[PDB]
Amino acid sequence: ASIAQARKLVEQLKMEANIDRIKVSKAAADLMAYCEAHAKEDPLLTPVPASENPFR
Amino acid sequence: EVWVVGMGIVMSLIVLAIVFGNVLVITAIAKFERLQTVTNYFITSLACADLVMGLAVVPFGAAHILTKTWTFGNFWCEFWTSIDVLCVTASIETLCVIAVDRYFAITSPFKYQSLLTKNKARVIILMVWIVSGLTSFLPIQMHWYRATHQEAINCYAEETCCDFFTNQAYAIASSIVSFYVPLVIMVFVYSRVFQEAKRQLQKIDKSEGRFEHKALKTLGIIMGTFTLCWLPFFIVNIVHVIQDNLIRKEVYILLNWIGYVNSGFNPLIYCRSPDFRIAFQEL
Amino acid sequence: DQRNEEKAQREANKKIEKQLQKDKQVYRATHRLLLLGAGESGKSTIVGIFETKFQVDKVNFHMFDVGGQRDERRKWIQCFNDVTAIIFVVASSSYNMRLQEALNLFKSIWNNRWLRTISVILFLNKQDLLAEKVLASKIEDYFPEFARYTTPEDATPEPEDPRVTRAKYFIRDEFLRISTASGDGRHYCYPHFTCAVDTENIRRVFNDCRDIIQRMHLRQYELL
Amino acid sequence: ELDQLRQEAEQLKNQIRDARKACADATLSQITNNIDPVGRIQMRTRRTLRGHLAKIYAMHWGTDSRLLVSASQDGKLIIWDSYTTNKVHAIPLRSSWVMTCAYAPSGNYVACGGLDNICSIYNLKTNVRVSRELAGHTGYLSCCRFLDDNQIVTSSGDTTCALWDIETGQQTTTFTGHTGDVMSLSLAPDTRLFVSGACDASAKLWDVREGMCRQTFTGHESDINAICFFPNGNAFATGSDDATCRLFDLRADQELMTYSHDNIICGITSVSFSKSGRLLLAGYDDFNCNVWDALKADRAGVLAGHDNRVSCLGVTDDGMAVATGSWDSFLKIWN
Ligand SMILES: Nc1nc2c(ncn2[C@@H]2O[C@H](COP(=O)(O)OP(=O)(O)OP(=O)(O)O)[C@@H](O)[C@H]2O)c(=O)[nH]1
Numbered sequence: 001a002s003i004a005q006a007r008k009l010v011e012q013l014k015m016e017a018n019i020d021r022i023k024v025s026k027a028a029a030d031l032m033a034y035c036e037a038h039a040k041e042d043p044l045l046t047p048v049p050a051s052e053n054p055f056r
Numbered sequence: 057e058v059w060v061v062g063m064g065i066v067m068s069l070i071v072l073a074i075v076f077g078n079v080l081v082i083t084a085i086a087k088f089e090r091l092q093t094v095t096n097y098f099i100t101s102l103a104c105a106d107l108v109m110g111l112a113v114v115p116f117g118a119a120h121i122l123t124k125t126w127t128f129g130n131f132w133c134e135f136w137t138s139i140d141v142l143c144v145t146a147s148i149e150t151l152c153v154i155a156v157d158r159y160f161a162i163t164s165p166f167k168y169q170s171l172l173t174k175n176k177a178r179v180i181i182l183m184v185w186i187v188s189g190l191t192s193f194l195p196i197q198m199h200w201y202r203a204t205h206q207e208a209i210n211c212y213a214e215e216t217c218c219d220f221f222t223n224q225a226y227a228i229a230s231s232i233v234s235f236y237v238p239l240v241i242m243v244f245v246y247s248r249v250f251q252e253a254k255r256q257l258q259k260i261d262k263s264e265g266r267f268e269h270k271a272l273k274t275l276g277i278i279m280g281t282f283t284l285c286w287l288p289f290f291i292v293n294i295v296h297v298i299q300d301n302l303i304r305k306e307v308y309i310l311l312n313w314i315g316y317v318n319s320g321f322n323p324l325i326y327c328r329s330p331d332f333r334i335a336f337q338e339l
Numbered sequence: 340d341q342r343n344e345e346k347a348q349r350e351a352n353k354k355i356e357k358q359l360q361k362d363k364q365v366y367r368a369t370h371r372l373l374l375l376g377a378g379e380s381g382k383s384t385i386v387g388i389f390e391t392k393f394q395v396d397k398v399n400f401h402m403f404d405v406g407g408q409r410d411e412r413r414k415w416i417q418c419f420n421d422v423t424a425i426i427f428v429v430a431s432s433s434y435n436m437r438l439q440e441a442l443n444l445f446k447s448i449w450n451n452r453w454l455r456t457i458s459v460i461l462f463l464n465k466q467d468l469l470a471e472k473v474l475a476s477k478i479e480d481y482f483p484e485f486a487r488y489t490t491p492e493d494a495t496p497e498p499e500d501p502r503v504t505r506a507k508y509f510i511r512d513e514f515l516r517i518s519t520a521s522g523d524g525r526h527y528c529y530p531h532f533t534c535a536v537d538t539e540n541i542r543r544v545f546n547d548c549r550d551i552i553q554r555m556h557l558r559q560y561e562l563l
Numbered sequence: 564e565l566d567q568l569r570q571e572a573e574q575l576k577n578q579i580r581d582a583r584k585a586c587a588d589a590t591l592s593q594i595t596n597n598i599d600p601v602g603r604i605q606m607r608t609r610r611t612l613r614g615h616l617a618k619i620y621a622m623h624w625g626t627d628s629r630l631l632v633s634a635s636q637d638g639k640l641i642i643w644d645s646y647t648t649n650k651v652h653a654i655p656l657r658s659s660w661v662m663t664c665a666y667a668p669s670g671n672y673v674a675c676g677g678l679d680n681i682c683s684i685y686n687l688k689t690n691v692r693v694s695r696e697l698a699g700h701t702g703y704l705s706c707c708r709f710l711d712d713n714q715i716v717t718s719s720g721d722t723t724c725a726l727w728d729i730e731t732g733q734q735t736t737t738f739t740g741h742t743g744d745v746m747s748l749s750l751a752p753d754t755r756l757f758v759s760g761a762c763d764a765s766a767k768l769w770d771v772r773e774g775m776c777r778q779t780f781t782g783h784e785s786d787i788n789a790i791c792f793f794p795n796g797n798a799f800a801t802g803s804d805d806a807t808c809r810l811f812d813l814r815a816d817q818e819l820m821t822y823s824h825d826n827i828i829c830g831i832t833s834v835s836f837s838k839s840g841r842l843l844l845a846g847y848d849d850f851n852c853n854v855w856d857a858l859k860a861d862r863a864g865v866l867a868g869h870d871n872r873v874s875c876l877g878v879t880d881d882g883m884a885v886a887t888g889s890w891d892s893f894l895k896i897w898n
């Protein structure tokens with residue numbers, strides 16, 4: 001009952017514990033590299049020409 | 057020039073405030089789309105009337121009374137008189153309409169939304185304005201109001217004097233149309249509103265007692281200033297024409313001037329809601 | 340060509356606007372009110388969401404039920420900040436069987452941030468059976484002393500033992516003691532005595548709602 | 564035996580927490596300090612949309628950055644055209660109480676579900692007309708999105724999420740494991756994994772194919788009201804009621820940044836990213852909208868002008884404009 005629900009959770013946590021983890025440095029480096037690489041086509045960040053904007 | 061020095065600031069002070077108390081109200085109403093409601097259109101019309109009155113008739117009257125010589129044409133002087141009458145008679149029916157709207161809102165709450173709509177407000181405003189105009193341009197452009205005695209004829213013949221001289225009938229028609237009729241309606245409206253407020257307070261007191269100055273103050277601040285400002289003028293206007301040699305020109309013009317300052321107290325009275333004050337604080 | 344295409348695009352906007360304008364008056368005319376109560380309070384007999392429509396003297400009311408589920412934490416309350424009035428249905432029959440939970444629920448509702456302005460109407464349903472329970476288990480046995488309570492003379496006993504009237508008055512004042520503190524004048528609570536025998540209770544609802552609207556309008560123009 | 568299971572749970576939970584802490588080489592703030600700041604950003608309103616009767620609850624942009632749908636409290640869906648600021652459709656509803664909107668990737672179907680335990684689907688191209696309706700939830704819906712043109716994933720208040728099938732109208736995979744109400748969800752660009760934020764201060768990542776939970780996050784302290792997914796596909800940012808926005812990490816399996824200002828104590832109702840992934844736009848209960856910086860946690864612009872609270876947000880597919888939905892029955896298009 002409650003014991004059964006606990007078993008259901010008891011099994012679940014163990015499964016979510018056997019995973020491979022990567023150092024935060026590599027993830028941060030990848031994130032910043034992607035953000036810097038795709039920072040030249042964002043109209044919000046960089047103002048586009050006035051004639052280009054359909055709303056103008 | 058001690059008398060001259062003084063009136064100059066005082067006539068000067070009144071002109072700036074009246075436009076100031078009008079342009080601020082109108083720009084606060086126009087700038088924000090929230091302040092607008094059916095109950096704001098009448099206030100907008102009243103503010104516009106006060107603005108045009110204070111921007112047209114006050115400086116001309118001050119110049120006429122200070123210089124003691126009218127240097128413009130007779131036609132322009134007649135136009136000045138007509139526009140003064142128009143503004144004076146249009147700055148009262150708006151208050152009457154506001155009172156009637158409040159009466160309908162309080163006494164009949166369920167049907168208030170259906171009774172008043174954005175389309176009917178424009179019709180009411182146009183009707184009030186045209187009623188005011190029918191007694192300002194139509195009888196003044198023509199010569200229905202002219203007097204008969206020699207002094208009036210001499211003044212109209214000369215191109216240097218502008219003194220209001222009028223036939224007995226006109227005085228009692230214009231006064232009745234402009235002041236006396238829009239008074240009893242407002243008195244009845246406010247009596248009914250006060251009765252309803254007292255009934256509600258008595259109802260709540262019995263229900264939640266163990267576990268009014270506000271209404272009196274609110275009605276006083278609305279009625280007393282208006283009656284004090286516009287009562288003496290609309291009794292002297294009829295007593296001086298029923299019989300002669302009773303009222304001097306000095307007191308007449310003084311009462312006329314004291315009536316003009318009422319248009320500047322409207323922004324400080326009818327715009328005391330916190331939403332109204334928020335716009336003033338922002339700007 | 341492009342002019343031709345756009346011109347039709349102009350036509351579509353106009354027809355919809357005419358309908359939105361037509362529907363605006365219908366939306367503004369109706370008055371809506373929520374019905375809320377604890378379990379076994381008799382809300383279902385009185386009446387997932389069950390929207391009921393009725394007309395009283397050319398006044399449109401749209402009564403929107405809330406539904407039934409065990410939800411200690413409620414998050415749909417934010418959706419009901421425009422309700423004209425909230426109907427509360429509570430039963431005094433459960434005093435020995437429990438009202439205290441209903442009182443706690445009422446206290447939680449009254450102090451909610453999203454419901455600061457909306458008033459509450461309370462119905463004391465199941466009051467008919469209270470007489471049998473009171474006269475031949477008593478309230479005085481509980482920690483709140485029914486016996487020590489002094490019966491107010493303001494309440495008029497309708498056509499009649501004093502014990503049942505005193506019990507009804509005490510139970511009624513129990514909710515008002517909670518309600519009056521946090522009201523601050525913005526919103527009030529309307530007590531009422533109701534039962535299934537009462538052939539018409541709408542008249543009472545109409546008189547309460549009209550007074551609520553009148554008081555709100557009076558407070559808006561700085562007259563109260 | 565329950566006690567034994569609980570002791571085992573502590574032993575595992577403690578093991579995990581230590582495993583997660585062992586991978587914290589350096590905070591993301593520490594590495595990212597030499598990046599040149601974006602600077603102050605000021606945006607002005609371009610278009611204003613009017614025509615609703617009541618407050619607006621949600622909205623969703625189209626796939627061509629042209630049309631957008633929105634649902635109001637009165638129970639009407641209006642499909643606009645921001646280029647010509649004119650209405651196109653007005654769909655009546657069976658129930659007035661609604662909370663959701665969606666738009667198909669093919670621009671052919673629109674779905675909305677509200678307080679009733681019913682999800683409705685309409686066909687825009689054929690007059691407006693109900694195509695299919697889905698039932699089976701015992702709680703109010705909170706958010707629905709089209710995963711494809713043949714199946715929808717929705718989250719209700721029953722602490723459950725399901726992936727419906729349009730042709731049959733019955734659930735094909737049911738997700739369970741939450742404790743409190745589920746409030747929002749978002750779909751990854753590859754339509755493989757989706758996340759959801761419950762009311763138990765816990766955000767979980769699920770699997771569409773297998774149908775089981777994978778990871779759990781517990782960084783917040785109150786309910787979660789909105790969630791967004793990073794363009795890269797390896798991060799997602801949430802929003803809670805304590806005026807805090809947190810950026811987690813799927814690979815590292817812990818949070819990295821928290822955005823909070825000492826001058827605000829309100830809540831958060833809408834969060835969305837930009838195309839470049841540098842700016843994180845969020846809405847508050849303080850009558851306005853704020854713009855953050857993903858990599859520097861520095862405010863770079865305040866968006867104000869709404870009469871009431873903001874309860875919707877959206878960014879076009881090409882990153883050309885951002886729209887906000889408020890309770891003042893007015894939509895605005897910023898740029
Ligand atoms: N003795 C008595 N019973 C009543 C009276 N009015 C209603 N009841 C009964 O009280 C019971 C409880 O009310 P219901 O209508 O069942 O309310 P409910 O089913 O709890 O309503 P929900 O909360 O919507 O589920 C019903 O069996 C009613 O018939 C009354 O005046 N006297």
Ligand SMILES: CN[C@@H]1CCc2c(ccc(O)c2O)[C@H]1O
Nearest residue numbers: 140141144220230231234293312
């Ligand atoms: C010059 N000022 C005038 C003089 C008399 C008068 C006014 C307004 C309405 C009338 O019916 C009047 O008789 C005043 O505005």
